[PDB]
């Protein structure tokens, strides 16, 4: 429901983006070419003109799965078997060149590149595709490792998972929900900056709360970390309301903030929630998703040079469609930045 208004606006922005670009739709690689949930989601995704899907796998292995489920319009969609691809040898040498001083010999560089996750990441890095969506079948750290060492982070960026909580008026952004165990104050500032750019993309004023178990205490440990993170972010972005350390209800509820901490620079409630450690971010978004009545979409991987998202291992068919939509949007956004 609230997804459906939010995702439909996102789907429209993908269409506005393809149009005024000749009608080019982003090429997205799916390493799990035989995944039932990926293929069923792709039925929706070509119907809706979101992307050209490129599936990885043994072609007949893939096609006979499609006809078993008989979802018709994946009729002609691209299928690539990594080690049969003409660029396989060039991909192997590039991964070897990247990793030969990280304990990776030519044979394992060959074995890694035959794995669809590495092949997909190299395809995106080398411009054979605009994005990838992986991790339907494997755990997050394994799915994200090929992405970080092949595609990597942009300058001063930090890889950080991000989730949207979709409310009646507003949405909230939560980060970092998937990658960093215990980010420093500097890293928390960088995660907040990345989260704010995403909020701005939707034409919304980002209002950033650095979360703690404390309200404006600044005591040793995380209160001080989250207080310092707010300060660093404010110096790197003096136009944004950024505040901390504060408790979560203090952060989201504007009447709580005004009544208890009127000196605070964050008014109107936070829509960006930065967490102090992975336990808190990862448990929070999952508890909201399971017991709250709010739809949470994501996680989405911020901080990487090209568009690449890891599906949470628990996702539904609706999740995958949402994730591809935002992978397409990100690929289009990255493709316009790259020219100017």
């Amino acid at each position: 429901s609230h997804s459906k208004v939010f995702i439909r606006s996102a789907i429209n922005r993908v269409h506005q983006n393809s149009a005024a670009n000749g009608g080019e739709l982003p090429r997205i690689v799916f390493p799990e070419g035989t995944s039932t949930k990926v293929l069923k989601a792709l039925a929706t995704l070509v119907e809706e003109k979101i992307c050209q899907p490129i599936l990885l796998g043994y072609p007949e292995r893939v096609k006979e799965k499609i006809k078993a489920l008989d979802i018709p319009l994946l009729n002609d969609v691209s299928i690539v078997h990594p080690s049969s691809h003409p660029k396989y040898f060039s991909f192997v040498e590039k991964l070897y060149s990247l990793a030969q001083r990280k304990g990776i010999n030519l044979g394992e560089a060959e074995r890694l590149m035959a794995d669809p996750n590495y092949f997909a990441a190299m395809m995106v890095n080398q411009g054979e595709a605009d994005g990838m969506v992986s991790g339907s079948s494997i755990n997050y750290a394994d799915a994200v490792r090929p992405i970080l060492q092949t595609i990597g982070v942009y300058k001063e960026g930090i890889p950080a998972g991000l989730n949207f909580v979709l409310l009646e008026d507003k949405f909230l952004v939560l980060a970092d929900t998937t990658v960093n165990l215990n980010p420093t104050a500097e890293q928390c500032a960088q995660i907040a900056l990345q989260a704010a750019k995403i909020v701005e993309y939707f034409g919304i004023e980002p209002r950033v709360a650095m979360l703690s178990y404390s309200n404006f205490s600044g005591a040793e440990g995380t209160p001080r970390k989250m207080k310092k993170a707010a300060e660093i972010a404010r110096s790197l972005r003096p136009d944004l309301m950024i505040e901390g350390d504060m408790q979560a209800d203090t952060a989201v509820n504007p009447e709580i903030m005004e009544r208890l901490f009127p000196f605070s620079g964050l008014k109107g409630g936070a829509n960006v929630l930065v967490f102090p450690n992975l336990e808190s971010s990862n448990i929070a978004y999952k508890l909201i998703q399971q017991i709250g009545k709010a739809e949470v979409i994501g996680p989405f991987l911020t901080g990487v040079r090209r568009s690449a998202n890891v599906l949470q291992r628990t996702t539904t068919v609706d999740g995958i469609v949402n994730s591809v939509v935002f992978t397409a949007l990100e690929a289009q956004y990255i493709k316009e930045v790259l020219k100017s």
Copy 2:
């Protein structure tokens, strides 16, 4: 929904009768707190407790009259340093604390503070429970409680919150006290939370929460797996499992589909957290977004009934907390008699 609260009110009444009809004496240090006084208006209607307010009687009565709350006339009001037992209370605090850096003059100043006086009242049986912390931060409110009442043997002070869903309630712990509990401490927190769930006639099913599903890797995955193992040792009759993610823990479908080897079936109703950031942020986010009622936090592990309100609380929040403080006071008074 309010059904869980109405059942608790009914139990408080069921408890009074079969004890002559006496109601637990609940002392409130913040005698002039607007939210506390508004909550008690509701709570005297329901015959939950005999409230004792602390403060200067005239200052308290003028506040009650300013708010136009007629039902609090004649409610007991006590000024700590004018009470007959003050000096005896000062002497007991001094004896508890004179080797913790507290001289007699400092013991006198502390006992004139309503939070210490209330905690001493509960400790000495002059009251059956206390509710504080509407106006001061949690650490300041809980220090007199821990220094005066203390924890029972093998207990650990740990805040606990109820999440009330349509079918079902969850308990969250530890939401207020321990920064980074060890595996041994998380196990003790689980047992404490499990006993509370049992009190309501529900089978406790305990999950040790992590950002990981059954990895046992270094750090909190290993800690929460070890916590589950220790918990299983001391109570082999309970479903206790970890390390696992929160959606795995509460959703019986995710568990059976992805981790069928797990000893926890049917979804967890006890969620033990690995550190204070995760526990504290979670219940406040659940409370603010999503439409589930969250009650608490309640201080477990302490020798007598004493609960600290979150500073962000509403008036209904306070009413809920007093109802369960009265239940806890009635239960602890049965234990104290058996002993």
Copy 3:
């Protein structure tokens, strides 16, 4: 002896006469303290300060009449939460402390406490100095001072004591604040102690104390040797030496006979200690054992004049402390005029 304190009292009078007969206003948070009130009887005759007592005017007068001390009939008495500036002080403390875990209601309770009200009075110029801590432990008395008045730039809060010998006085530091100062902190403590000694027209000679004589081994010998080196670079005109034992430091014959290469001749009169255990135990043992007067401790490194009495103090100790707090208030009020 009596010469040093009487010379100090005279220096307060020279400063007062040179400012139109003004006396420094000194706040005493412990307005009902028996030892504070008895000490003030001595000090009101000598016209060293205008005392301001904090408390409920009646219980303070009730106690003055119990102790049957007539020259305090006219002493000013202030109840913090009744004072006209109370709410502005509360707002000021709230503003400085609202991101240090202090809400407005807690700022109100702290400012009603005499110790915080005294520190704010000194900070805000309603008084020139304060003296506290006869009745509470040192950490509790000094916290409002450090949180409200604070340290001057690059300064460090450090307790200092004078040991009064027939010839000479010694200065001991840091006797009260820092558990385990670094080499950098020990040099800064030496610098603060050195300026106090110069104020009395004495040449400072600084020893960085250890359990070792010029070994420079790992742990405190190396720390005190590095502290001496840091201090010498920040003050190349002063004799500063370490690491050395306490008898080596104070006895010039031991130094010359055993360590002739040393840059410290004639015996040290500034003794900087390696940790709080050694400083605090030393001045207290000296004070109790052997007959040297020990005065202090005096809180150095802070922006305005504020000293905390040791809880074990006598009535004469308080008298000595008020005298030197008055001199400090006068000195800081001359610096502020620039």
Copy 4:
């Protein structure tokens, strides 16, 4: 004052008599030390010990003749590597040290050093005690003693000093060995200190010193509070208390007024320190500026009588130390008589 010292001198005399009139054989590794020789002049009149001087006989005798001390002209003189027991001593040290990085040639060189030969003489019963360290730093003097004589079981090596006041004496420890004793070690130091006090017929009253009064806060307050608890369980008949400040410990009026719950009444006469900086600085400052005699340091916890003089000692101090070393040798020679 000196009443305490001749009381000890007389106790040595009553001890030699009723035993055969023999005097304890005390070896001095520093046979050519000016301060040692001048001190021994005083001590042979008083018939305190047979000194055995170590060194080359000719070198030692010309020093005695240079200083014009006629009364040392038939003191025994021993050259380690010429002594009949040298080779057997080398091999006992070699067998003990051959897995601690010491080959046979190095055992020969160590045993030719007077400090090691003296420790071996005392260990092997060729002498009753030793006194060393007038000329070298304490750690170098005490290493042969600890490696050769060692500690008795559950003992800990700890320096101890007597502070002699008009009415009473104080005992201070650990003044020389342990940098940062644990609570367990501090309790053991207290037990050793208490028995030394009992030898003089005095009731030991033990204070564990800190910069805090009965706070138990983290770090040394908790350590010294725990040390008192361990000590009280190991000797429930003694007043042992802590953590407390030094003036609290020694002054009975301060203790009673501020801390009446304390189990220590009448003032402490045994002061156990939390670290070596505080102990070492304290006894040295008292000795130099306090106006009481300080004797020691004396090495406790070791199987036989062996004491290391402080490098800063006077001739007079060396005399005091030898007297109590003689008493200790006599006491240990009665215990060995099992």
Copy 5:
């Protein structure tokens, strides 16, 4: 020496003839490895094992025909995911690892990897041993072995190498697995090495290596000294000694002359190293610049026979490794039957 290897080959034949002529079933995960196939040409004439190659059948067959190795035309070839036991193996691996972050689908991919399938074949008795790692790094080849076969009681996985000199052979351990073994672990490594030496009818004489000779100083000297002590208590019939330098260890004349108290006479033939850098570099340097043949490494401490070749191995190395893998497989079959 090829003299030593030929004795091993004959011992395999004696073991086979004494078990009905059965030869050990040895799995090779690297079924297409050129060096492995070339080695197997040699190993099928010596009748050492029945080889089982893992891989897809024509890839393995196409490779055999490419290299034109006629004797491997009928060697068994197994494609893991087509094997009838595959799903049973997955369920067993899943049950072992499902609380180590391995879901069922991941257990499926792992079991399709030949290294895991080979390890599970050995674990479940479908083969008697395995040889892997010609093509992948050591830690990747050994992880499936450690996770699947595991270590026996109180065992520790540790690589062991034979250095074959004219007179004697030396054993080196741990050459591949443990970065920084504790004294407890180093003693276990010695015990494991000693049993292997006994198997060849030789008396093991064990040296715990260090950069120090019988010093026992902090760090590695103390570690190797305690390791010698632990091993001696766990095996009082063996000469075990340390800490010592490598030339001291191997040269009996150096031992006799410089450390005659040592319990090791005749030179050590078991050399235990203090960390992985020293063990790994030593055996590789001996192999390259000495003129002694070095065989191994062989994985000790594990429940069944599984050896990982060093990636740098030659074809002769693999032949040497399979011979001793065959011997170990035959030995482990007698233990399993008794």
Copy 6:
């Protein structure tokens, strides 16, 4: 092998002949060492050095005559405390060490030790080099050298050994001094070793050794990879590479076959080790079992020529070390020639 040393002997003769007819004065602290004296018989025949033996002249002479070494009846013999420069040497050591815990009496006693006297002779130009340590452990022999002669600018003290194979020679470092050098220190060791290889007109090719091949993992793999990077930036003309395994380092085929991206080709001839266990064990193992001549260790990084023999050395070992000590002394006298 005999070629490399004879070439070294001849280069000594050309440098001396180019320098009048003088040969370096080499002082030997161990004047009665049997192995030192037997080696000196060989070396004065070879007209390598002007030897100075330290000790009591009669004790040394009867050792020489007892062993019947006729060519030594005219070698210089010096008793340190009888030498004219003794007291000036004591004063120079006192100045160097008086803030490191060494009093004047300790400086006199240390300077009577031949190891300290020899080091002071080399420092003060009374000799051109020294050779010590045949009879005492390495750390005791090298301490006087480091405390007296010291390290040159940005240098690090590091032991170095030559391994002589038929084709070439390898250099190993640091074999004697640093327990666990940082990445920065390993680079400095590489630079020092590289200069020594250059001195013989050979191209230095440097391997930073690990138990890993180009992994860069945490611990020594990352340390040796970073060390190679630091060394390459300070010396961009040299092949410097790591982290790598030892067989990878020396064998150029293994390198080319398995790691062709590597910048070190033709095999390493400079091997820098990650820790003292690995360097020290490797050179001693090679020396005993590798059937290669190993020369050293030689002390690099020090201002003047001073080498410590390993205690396990042979007579031929000593002869080799003295030859290269002479070459080093001659070379250091051309550098001082600016």
